[PDB]
Amino acid sequence: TQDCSFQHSPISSDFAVKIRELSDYLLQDYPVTVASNLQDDELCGGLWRLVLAQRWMERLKTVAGSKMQGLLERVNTEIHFVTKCAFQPPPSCLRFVQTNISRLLQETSEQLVALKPWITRQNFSRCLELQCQP
Amino acid sequence: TQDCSFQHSPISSDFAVKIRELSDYLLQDYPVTVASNLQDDELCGGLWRLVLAQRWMERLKTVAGSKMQGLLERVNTEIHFVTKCAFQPPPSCLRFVQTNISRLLQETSEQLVALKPWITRQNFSRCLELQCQP
Numbered sequence: 430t431q432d433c434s435f436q437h438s439p440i441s442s443d444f445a446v447k448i449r450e451l452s453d454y455l456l457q458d459y460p461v462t463v464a465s466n467l468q469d470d471e472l473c474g475g476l477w478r479l480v481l482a483q484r485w486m487e488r489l490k491t492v493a494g495s496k497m498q499g500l501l502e503r504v505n506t507e508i509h510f511v512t513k514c515a516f517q518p519p520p521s522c523l524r525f526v527q528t529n530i531s532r533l534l535q536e537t538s539e540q541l542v543a544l545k546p547w548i549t550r551q552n553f554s555r556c557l558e559l560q561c562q563p
Numbered sequence: 564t565q566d567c568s569f570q571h572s573p574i575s576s577d578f579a580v581k582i583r584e585l586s587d588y589l590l591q592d593y594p595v596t597v598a599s600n601l602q603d604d605e606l607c608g609g610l611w612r613l614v615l616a617q618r619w620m621e622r623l624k625t626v627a628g629s630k631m632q633g634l635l636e637r638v639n640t641e642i643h644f645v646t647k648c649a650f651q652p653p654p655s656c657l658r659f660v661q662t663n664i665s666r667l668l669q670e671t672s673e674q675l676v677a678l679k680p681w682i683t684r685q686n687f688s689r690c691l692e693l694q695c696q697p
C-alpha cells in the first residue's frame with residue numbers, strides 16, 4: 430500500500446511571506462478553481478486542497494511571465510511536498526467551482542497553518558484517494 | 564464643438580518597456596475583452612481600441628496587488644492621453660469578446676506604434692463616437 434507520512438516537517442516557517450509576495454503582483458480575481466464537494470475529513474481535508482492548490486501552481490507557471498514564474502514557483506516550493514506522496518488523480522465525483530486566485534492563495538496559507546502541528550504526527554496513507562460528498 | 568487633438572507628447576518612446584515590464588509579472592491568459600465589431604476607420608481604429616484598453620487598465624487596477632498596481636499604473640500612463648478627449652460611451656451595437664490580457668497588451672503596443680507618427684498631427688474629433696461595422 431502506498432503510504433504517506435513525513436518524518437521531518439516539510440512546511441517552512443516563512444511560507445506566508447512567499448504568498449504575500451506572490452499576491453503583491455497578482456490580479457486577484459484571476460480565475461482558478463477549488464473543489465466544491467470535498468468530503469468532510471478533518472485529517473485529509475487541508476491536504477486534499479493543498480494537493481489541488483499545488484496542481485494549480487504548476488498550471489499557472491506555464492502561462493506566467495518571466496518574473497511571475499518565480500513568484501509562483503516560490504509558492505509552489507512551499508507546498509510541493511504533497512507530491513512526495515502518490516496522490517491519486519481526482520475522482521469523477523469531484524466538482525470544481527471557479528474562484529479568485531486570491532481565494533485559493535488565502536486558503537492555501539490557512540491549510541498550511543492548520544496542517545503545521547500535525548504534518549509529522551499523522552499517517553496520511555488514506556488521504557491518497559480524494560473523496561467526495563454529495 | 565468637442566475637439567480631440569494632441570499637440571504635446573501623447574505617445575512616448577518607452578511604452579513597449581513599461582508594457583513588457585508589466586507582462587513579465589502577468590498570468591498571460593487572464594481574461595479581458597476587445598471589441599469584435601469596431602467599424603473600419605483608419606483614423607479612429609487604433610484610438611478606439613486604446614480607449615478600450617485604457618478602461619481595462621483602470622479596471623484591472625482595482626483588483627491588482629499593491630505591486631501589480633504600480634506596473635499597471637505606469638502602462639496606463641502611456642495611454643492616458645485618450646482620456647483627454649470626450650469619448651462617448653460605447654454604442655449598444657458594440658460586441659465584445661473575451662481574450663487573454665497578453666493579446667490586449669500586444670495589440671495596445673502595436674496600436675501605439677502605428678499611432679505614434681500621427682498622434683500629434685491629426686485631428687481626432689470624429690473619433691469621440693465609437694462606431695460598429697454594419
Ligand SMILES: [Zn+2]
Nearest residue numbers: 431432433434
Ligand atoms: Zn515509506
Ligand SMILES: [Zn+2]
Nearest residue numbers: 435436437438
Ligand atoms: Zn531525522
Ligand SMILES: [Zn+2]
Nearest residue numbers: 487505509512
Ligand atoms: Zn513540480
Ligand SMILES: [Zn+2]
Nearest residue numbers: 575577578581
Ligand atoms: Zn513612458
Ligand SMILES: [Zn+2]
Nearest residue numbers: 603604605606
Ligand atoms: Zn477604410
Ligand SMILES: [Zn+2]
Nearest residue numbers: 621639643646
Ligand atoms: Zn485618468
